[PDB]
Amino acid sequence: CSDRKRKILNGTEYIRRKSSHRGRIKRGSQAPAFKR
Amino acid sequence: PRGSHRGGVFPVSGLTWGMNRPYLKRGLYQHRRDHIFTPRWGTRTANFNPSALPDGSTRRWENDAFKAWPLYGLPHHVKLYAVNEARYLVPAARCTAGPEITQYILNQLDPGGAGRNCSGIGRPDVRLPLAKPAAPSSPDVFDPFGTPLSERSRIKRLYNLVCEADSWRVKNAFPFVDEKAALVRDLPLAEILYCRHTHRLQSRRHPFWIDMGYKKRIVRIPYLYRRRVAKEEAQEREFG
Amino acid sequence: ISTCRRRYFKMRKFHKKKYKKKLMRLKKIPFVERTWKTYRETRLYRKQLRRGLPKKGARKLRLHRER
Amino acid sequence: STRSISGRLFYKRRPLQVPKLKPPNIRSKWLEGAPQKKGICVKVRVQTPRKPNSGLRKVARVRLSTGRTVLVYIPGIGHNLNVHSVVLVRGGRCKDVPGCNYKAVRGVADLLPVKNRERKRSKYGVKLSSEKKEWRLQRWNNKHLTIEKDRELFNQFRWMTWRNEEGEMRTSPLADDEEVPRHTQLFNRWYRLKMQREG
RNA sequence: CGGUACGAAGUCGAAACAAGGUAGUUGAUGGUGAACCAGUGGCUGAACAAAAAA
RNA sequence: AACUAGUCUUAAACACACCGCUCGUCACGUAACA
RNA sequence: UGAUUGGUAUUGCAUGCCUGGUGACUUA
RNA sequence: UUCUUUGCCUGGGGGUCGUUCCGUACAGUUGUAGGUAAAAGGUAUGUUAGAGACUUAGACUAGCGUUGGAGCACAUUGUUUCAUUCGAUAGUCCACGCUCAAUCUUACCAUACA
RNA sequence: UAAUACAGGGUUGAACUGUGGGUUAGUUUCAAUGCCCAAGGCAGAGCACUGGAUUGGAUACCCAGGGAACUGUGCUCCCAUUAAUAAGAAUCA
RNA sequence: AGAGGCUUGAUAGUACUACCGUAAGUACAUAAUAUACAGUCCCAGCAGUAGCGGUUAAACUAUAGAAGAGUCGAGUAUUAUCCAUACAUACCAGGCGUAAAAAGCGUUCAUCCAAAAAAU
RNA sequence: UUUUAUGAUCCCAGGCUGGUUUAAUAAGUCAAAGUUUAGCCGGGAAG
RNA sequence: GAAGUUAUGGUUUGAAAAAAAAA
RNA sequence: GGCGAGAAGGGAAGUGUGUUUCAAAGAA
């Protein structure tokens, strides 16, 4: 969470991680969504 | 360990180092024994003997020699032992419970019995310095022969305490008030390390090199003394 | 976290998003064109001279030993 | 304090939860656990130290035998390193130069030892010169010095029964133009012993 | 390729810290040489002003 | 109703103390990853 | 009616002495 | 530093065929280079606030006079000269150093003597 | 957040019951706004954009107008993600 | 100096096995040296984080700078390796309001623990 | 029907064990894991 | 000769077979 | 003709190697 939340805050995850939340710039999910 | 000391090097005596301190720089200075407690248990002589005959008149005892080489059994030792024996026997003397408890207290005060060396104080056949004289130990039973009571030997523990007390015996004005004074004195490390030897550092240096350092000093110290004295004398001659 | 510290992450995240949006328009994918070992690789084996075998034993390696 | 070994999987969980600080000597990771590595100087230049410090630091980019290229500081005053020069490189961090974590061993390979150096010689690969060796022996030829206390004591105690180096005896105390004689069996004993042992 | 870290301080503005002179920042967005701006929903890691009772 | 000197309260990322601190593009070289 | 040991050259961002402006100076 | 059980953290910060799975897909991603001796929480004062309140102490106001409009004098600035010496430069420079310069004062310039 | 319909939870009491629990992934019901999709579509207000001003200058703050978004058993959980700083036992009258 | 290596700006208690203040290299010889000095001036350079060097440096270079000073010593120093001294790898022995850290709120499986601990 | 989050299916890297002394009221076995003569083990072939 | 014997690192990318059906 | 002879093996193997706890009879 320290380095993990730091990556979230600086936005690496925003770019590199798929999101079932979608958005027009973020990567999307083409498979049914489930909590991981 | 091996190699030179890596880190902080402090004098083993506990004295600080500085421009106006006993040591100019950091170091252990284990050879400097003038900064530790070395009692003088011998004698002392002088550089010169004024008398025309070598009678050894300069030789004299050191002050610490009288504590180093004591003599026991002196009259003040005897007097102190007598007073302390009276006070110490007070309990058994004033016990009024019974012979059993009296013997118990006497044994506690001065252990004794078969195979032991005691003072025989409580024995019926030993003389004591009573205040009110009484029968040594009614008329029916006694000793028909003379049989004088034997003397009592000393209490070894108490006598040793009395004798050793000597080692622990310790020997208007210009009204100028001090303002730059300390209210509670001060307790540096040197005051401890001077006399409490077990707190000081044990050397890792070779005794060979310790002896070599002593031999070097014996030859080099006079040269430094003469160096500074010659500086001063040359300056005085130039001024003259 | 405080607002003053939040501004650094704000700026870096915004720069990332902006630079991705800049490329969002394009459609042609750009094309982009080791003897030395890494520290983690080096840390696996011990270089101290044991009896012969360079890297053939637990005492030679730094793996978790079962004991 | 034992909240970290709760449950059944403590023996696998807790050993994972530990400090994760950098290794003590990770600054020299490109030596690959070796005392030192040989490298080729790909670039030789002078860099500007981080402020507030000012000046020029002599540095070189060197390609180690492992193939990695690293920044190496050239300790000492003056050097002859150029491009394509082989240098032995050890672990040493120059705090001024950014990213510099290795130094070059003087006197090894093409890196000559520092000139006009007389202290810390073992840290720059400087041998003990013959002049220094000769002076470390001729230095302890003791000098004779007096403070007039020697004169007083000699005229009071010693002149009465004194023997010259040749064995001659004295017949008068020290004059005003005569120095206090040396002790034939104690003065300069160590140096004389060494000279006589040599020959 | 785009981005990133170090040295340098050059041009352009003045976005934040005071109500920083339009409160700040956040989720996903739209727009813009640059910091940024606008709407919407969150928070406070914000202010201003602030009741007697008929 | 305004100003200076105070004096009081609040806020502060200022403490060389708002002539403070401080953000970024562009330009400029040395590099790692890709 | 009793003369003297160079420089009114730089450096007030080396200082002493001396000034300007603003602040203070409360006790039993 | 009473006890039970899950979740997470290791200074700061940066870049980044496994699938007989539908492949520009699914699943998965804190971690390796390059920088770093700091970074960041609070209380205590000061300073500031295009923040607020207050004493009404000065400021305003009111009264007596000015100055900016014209002439002269001083200083300063601009110009010029071989030189028109120099310092002072918001308040705290500008009738100031210089409480008085035709000679001297003079420290500026020209000439010729050492 | 009036009434009505259908469901909880909480509180109080009686009965029943009799260690029947505390925590929880190879678990999945729900969950602001935005975005994708679908709906409708001009009550209000309102990105981008237009033009009326201020500014050396503004791509803004101010004004007028405005076809993006504002109601879904869908897709769906990114967050300064919801009553707080995880849940339970013990210590108190 | 029977000998060299390293230090010669501050900073580290220099450990520790028997002795545990129960003594003399005690006195004389025998009293000291370096925040004295010289060369360089944000240069050359040094250093361990901090830092020093701005033309009068106990911090760079120099030890005939003096028979100089501190330690170890036939050795000594640099680099490297670690279970790298309590950068407690935190069981002994760290944390999760504000400084890194409580999952968005919840329902559960397995494990774990509770209530008849130890014994049965 | 058999395995499987107590890690099945399924890649790469590594044989395991012992060594007496061992300062500090840190020891009566060196005390989660650090070794050094050694212990145990490590196919078959003239077809 | 037998019976018991915690796995570790490379970040890892959860179901694998058999059987049934298929042609 | 009879005995002995592995340059004293690190080439295989991860739930393996080894370790710990045991057990092992001819002349029945």
Contacts of A1 in chain C (CB under 8 A): none
Q: Can you tell me the distance from the alpha carbon of D76 to that of D172, in angstroms, rounded to the nearest whole number?
A: 63
- In Å, how far is C27's CA from the nearest CA of chain D? 37
**What residues contact residue D46 under an 8 Å CB cut-off, 6+ apart?**
D56, D57, D58, D59
Spell out the SS3 assignment of D68-101.
CEEEEECCCCCCCCCCCCEEEEEECCCCCCCCCC
Which is it for the CA torsion D52, D57, D61, D64, positive or negative? Answer: negative
Residue C41 in tokens: 């690789």
What is the Rg, in whole angstroms, of the alpha carbon atoms belonging to chain B?
A: 32
Which is it for the CA torsion B102, B108, B110, B116, positive or negative? Answer: positive
Cβ(D35)–Cβ(D90) under 8 Å?
yes
Q: Can you tell me the distance from the alpha carbon of D192 to that of D183, in angstroms, rounded to the nearest whole number?
A: 13
Cβ(D89)–Cβ(D73) under 8 Å?
no
Residue C12 in tokens: 């870096």
Alpha helices in B96-206 (DSSP H): 99-109, 156-168, 189-193
* Best mutation target, D144, D147, D191, to test chain B (most B CBs within 10 A): D147
- Confirm or reject contact between A12 and chain C (CB < 8 A): yes
| D114 φ, ψ (degrees, to nearest 5) | -65, 135
**How many Cβ atoms sit within 10 Å of the Cβ of residue D59?**
20
**How many Cβ atoms sit within 10 Å of the Cβ of residue D103?**
21
Q: How was this structure determined?
A: cryo-EM
Cβ(A28)–Cβ(A18) under 8 Å?
yes
User: By three-state DSSP, how is residue D31 classified?
Assistant: helix
Report the DSSP beta bridge partners of residue B210. none
**Among D75, D83, D130, CA closest to D100:** D75
With an 8 Å Cβ cutoff, are D147 and B230 in contact? yes
**Does residue B11 have a cis peptide bond before it, meaning omega lies within 30 degrees of 0?**
no
Cβ(D98)–Cβ(D129) under 8 Å?
no
Strand blocks (E) in chain B: 43-44, 60-61
The helix-helix angle for B75-94 and B99-109 (nearest 10°) equals: 150
b/e D20-40 (16+ beta carbons within 10 angstroms → b): eeeeeeeebbbbbeeebbebb
Q: State which H helix or E strand residue D192 sits in.
A: helix D189-198
B127-135 — which CB contacts under 8 Å span 24+ positions? Answer: B127/B151, B127/B152, B128/B152
Cβ(D149)–Cβ(B225) under 8 Å?
no
Give burial (CB, 10 Å; 0-12/13-18/19+) of B107.
middle
Residue B117 in tokens: 């060396």
D174-179 — which CB contacts under 8 Å span 24+ positions? Answer: D179/D144, D179/D146
